[PDB]
Design an enzyme around this catalytic site. Sequence first.
Site, PDB file in Angstrom:
ATOM      1  CE  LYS A 187      -5.450  -2.957  -0.035  1.00 20.75           C
ATOM      2  NZ  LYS A 187      -5.775  -1.458  -0.305  1.00 20.75           N
TER       3      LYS A 187
ATOM      4  CG  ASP B  91      -9.508   4.846  -2.259  1.00 21.71           C
ATOM      5  OD1 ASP B  91      -9.634   3.891  -2.598  1.00 21.71           O
ATOM      6  OD2 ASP B  91      -8.066   5.347  -2.014  1.00 21.71           O
TER       7      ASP B  91
ATOM      8  CD1 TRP C 250      -2.620   4.149   1.576  1.00 21.22           C
ATOM      9  CD2 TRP C 250      -3.329   4.959  -0.176  1.00 21.22           C
ATOM     10  NE1 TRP C 250      -2.169   3.473   0.710  1.00 21.22           N
ATOM     11  CE2 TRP C 250      -2.381   3.847  -0.556  1.00 21.22           C
ATOM     12  CE3 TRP C 250      -3.935   5.569  -1.353  1.00 21.22           C
ATOM     13  CZ2 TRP C 250      -2.042   3.328  -1.709  1.00 21.22           C
ATOM     14  CZ3 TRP C 250      -3.654   5.138  -2.682  1.00 21.22           C
ATOM     15  CH2 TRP C 250      -2.561   3.916  -2.904  1.00 21.22           C
TER      16      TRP C 250
HETATM   17  C1  PLP Z   1      -5.254  -0.520  -0.980  1.00 17.17           C
HETATM   18  C2  PLP Z   1      -5.691   0.759  -0.965  1.00 17.17           C
HETATM   19  C3  PLP Z   1      -5.757   1.295  -2.555  1.00 17.17           C
HETATM   20  C4  PLP Z   1      -5.378   0.942  -3.857  1.00 17.17           C
HETATM   21  O1  PLP Z   1      -4.546  -0.264  -3.620  1.00 17.17           O
HETATM   22  P1  PLP Z   1      -4.076  -1.110  -5.180  1.00 17.17           P
HETATM   23  O2  PLP Z   1      -3.113  -2.032  -4.187  1.00 17.17           O
HETATM   24  O3  PLP Z   1      -3.460  -0.246  -5.896  1.00 17.17           O
HETATM   25  O4  PLP Z   1      -5.390  -1.907  -5.417  1.00 17.17           O
HETATM   26  C5  PLP Z   1      -6.164   2.875  -2.653  1.00 17.17           C
HETATM   27  N1  PLP Z   1      -6.761   3.377  -1.472  1.00 17.17           N
HETATM   28  C6  PLP Z   1      -6.609   2.848  -0.121  1.00 17.17           C
HETATM   29  C7  PLP Z   1      -7.171   3.678   1.062  1.00 17.17           C
HETATM   30  C8  PLP Z   1      -6.020   1.631  -0.023  1.00 17.17           C
HETATM   31  O5  PLP Z   1      -6.077   1.113   1.225  1.00 17.17           O
END
Ligand code: PLP
EC number: 2.6.1.1
Lengths: 396, 396
Positions: free
Chosen positions: A246, A211, A130
């Site tokens: 999500k 994460d 990410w």
């Molecule tokens: C969606 C996501 C997050 C954190 O998202 P928030 O919208 O702040 O809850 C962190 N790491 C990954 C790999 C993600 O896909």
Amino acid sequence: MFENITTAPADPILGLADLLRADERPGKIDLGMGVYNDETGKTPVLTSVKKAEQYLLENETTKNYLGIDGIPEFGRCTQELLFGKGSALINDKRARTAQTPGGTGALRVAADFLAKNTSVKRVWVSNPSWPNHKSVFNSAGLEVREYAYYDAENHTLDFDALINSLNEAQAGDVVLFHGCCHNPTGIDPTLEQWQTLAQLSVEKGWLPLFDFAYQGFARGLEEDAEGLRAFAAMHKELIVASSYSKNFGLYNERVGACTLVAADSETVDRAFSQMKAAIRVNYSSPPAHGASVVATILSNDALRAIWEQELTDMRQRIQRMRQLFVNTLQEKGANRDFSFIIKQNGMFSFSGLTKEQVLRLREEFGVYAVASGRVNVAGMTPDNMAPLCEAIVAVL
Amino acid sequence: MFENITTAPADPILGLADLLRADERPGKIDLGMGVYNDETGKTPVLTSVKKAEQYLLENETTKNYLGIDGIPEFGRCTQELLFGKGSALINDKRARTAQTPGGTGALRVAADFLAKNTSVKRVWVSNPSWPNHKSVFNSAGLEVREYAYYDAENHTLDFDALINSLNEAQAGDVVLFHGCCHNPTGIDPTLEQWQTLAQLSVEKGWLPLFDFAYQGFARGLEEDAEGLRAFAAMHKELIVASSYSKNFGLYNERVGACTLVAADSETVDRAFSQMKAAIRVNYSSPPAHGASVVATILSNDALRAIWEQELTDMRQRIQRMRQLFVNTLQEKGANRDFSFIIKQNGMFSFSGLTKEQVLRLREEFGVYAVASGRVNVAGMTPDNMAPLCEAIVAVL
Ligand SMILES: *Cc1c(COP(=O)(O)O)cnc(C)c1O
Ligand SMILES: *Cc1c(COP(=O)(O)O)cnc(C)c1O
């Protein structure tokens, strides 16, 4: 004072949103940001969530500040979800959880905490990962190094390059792992590989940081946590940044958690006191609404049953689109074989498209994807599948 | 990794909450954290707020991420509240507002933005001030200096010491001002003094940063913004960190805003792009629920009428307790004259009590106040006034 400030570069993911609402050309297809869409291409509020909001409206009697670490029940339900009901970590009270503003908030709090309370100086992240990962840790003053992960040629996890790449990681370095549904590749380690990593981690003396933003989207709630639990069984310390954006469809309520684990309760308590200090100088205390909904749902057998099913429905619809996508590409005269996409889990898929092909898809067909070639399968519907695949075939 | 971490010092304000829920001794009186209480000693959800939540439950169709800067309407209503309906700043589009997680969140975002995008190195704060001010700016890597403000002997604003103290402030330094209801003294500058400050500010080249967490608690919404508007009329640039925690009783939903003002729209837009970059590496996007409620209320004539009245009721009840407090102290045989407390506005009052007297009040009488002698008048009720004043008389 602000005369010479330079314009910031657009975010590779969030920037697509701006381009979308600036594109008149109707029929646009958004496969960018990782948000779930149903068969209609809408992102509805879960029913379990609406029912919990109904409950909160009728029973909330005050909006008085929550403690710095948030709602206690929320923390408890989170730990049970991560480590398992009868986990030793919970019984021995070795884990402390702070409710945070989203998974991003959890990563930022972990970063600040590490930077000013430990000797940590480097954080290892997968290649690719990410994009905001590097940005968050760098903002805290920590340097980021990358370790091999994806085999672009075979579209699989190159475990040998990963292990060898990590030998460069010194004891005391932090190594970030995606719990499941690796963003952006969708390729996760098998249970045996996790076990091998857990063992290696302990031996090299790395501090694992997970994460976990997609628990429930690969195989299931418990199955998706097997990797983390493998690590939790051999490690005395670790950090988990989780997100409910999500799996609860609560994106804009910013609900996440940062869990800290130490060898014993006295040590985690001392460490946690410094984590709370880091929160106080950031946003003070977390937003109640979102987390309240998650705690209400998870602590109520009735609501949890509904939510778990809605989650199952989301996972199953993405798995169907993943199938329809591959079949339609072939059916539409696709150049090469995309069967590898069937082996990836989560909302995403590293398509293999070049930056130019992605740019052309956006410029000529109104199809929006991330420049890395990452596509959000969850944004595909039976209705946009045809034009979407025709556009992709035209750029191959 | 966490073996040698030291226990963090308890927060001077938030730490009182922990002592309270650890004190069996019934009849406890909480005059610590700045939270409003009604005649019953409860902190209820405003009616206007409940009605807005009802509206959101029936009409919200998605929880999809808001933009990095939050709800646009929220930003618009905020700017109108701060600068005035027909303000030139708005018409010339010189201001950009980012919705943040509380007023603390707004200050943190302003801090990060300044630290990595400007040459700012020092921030001047009043002596005394909200304790978290120094902590937030220091966390961003900025040094904090204090300027004289309160005259402990005469219980008034020492304007001459303030001006002279600030002559030490160089051009390009940031000077923080409390919009109204100075925390903890409750002593605000008169309109003429604000005008003198605005003029001096422009001449010395300081960057004004206003902390506006109590608009509406001194005299009224518009009257409370006179000082800021005086500055906004002569300055090309400034920053406003506002909070809706108190005037909307939305403490735990974390609703605040960070407003940036520049000489023109092209400059503020460039600057704002960097502010959004700073948010992306912190919590990504703000929590929707709280801000949604504020925007719904302020944009609806019906709901805004109810809310404004509830706000008026809160201000008037604190003004009554401020009176009953002084009269009861005298009536209970108080040693000295506390009439000066009548001249302070907001929920607080710098009582003049020493740290030992505050400690004794807590230890022997179960009365909790901040070690600085700051007391939350909004926590006083007709029912706890008697025992509260008797305890204070016993320690004089
Ligand atoms: C969606 C996501 C997050 C954190 O998202 P928030 O919208 O702040 O809850 C962190 N790491 C990954 C790999 C993600 O896909
Ligand atoms: C309450 C307050 C804030 C910010 O509080 P939030 O709860 O984060 O909205 C900031 N400054 C002062 C002086 C305050 O009293």
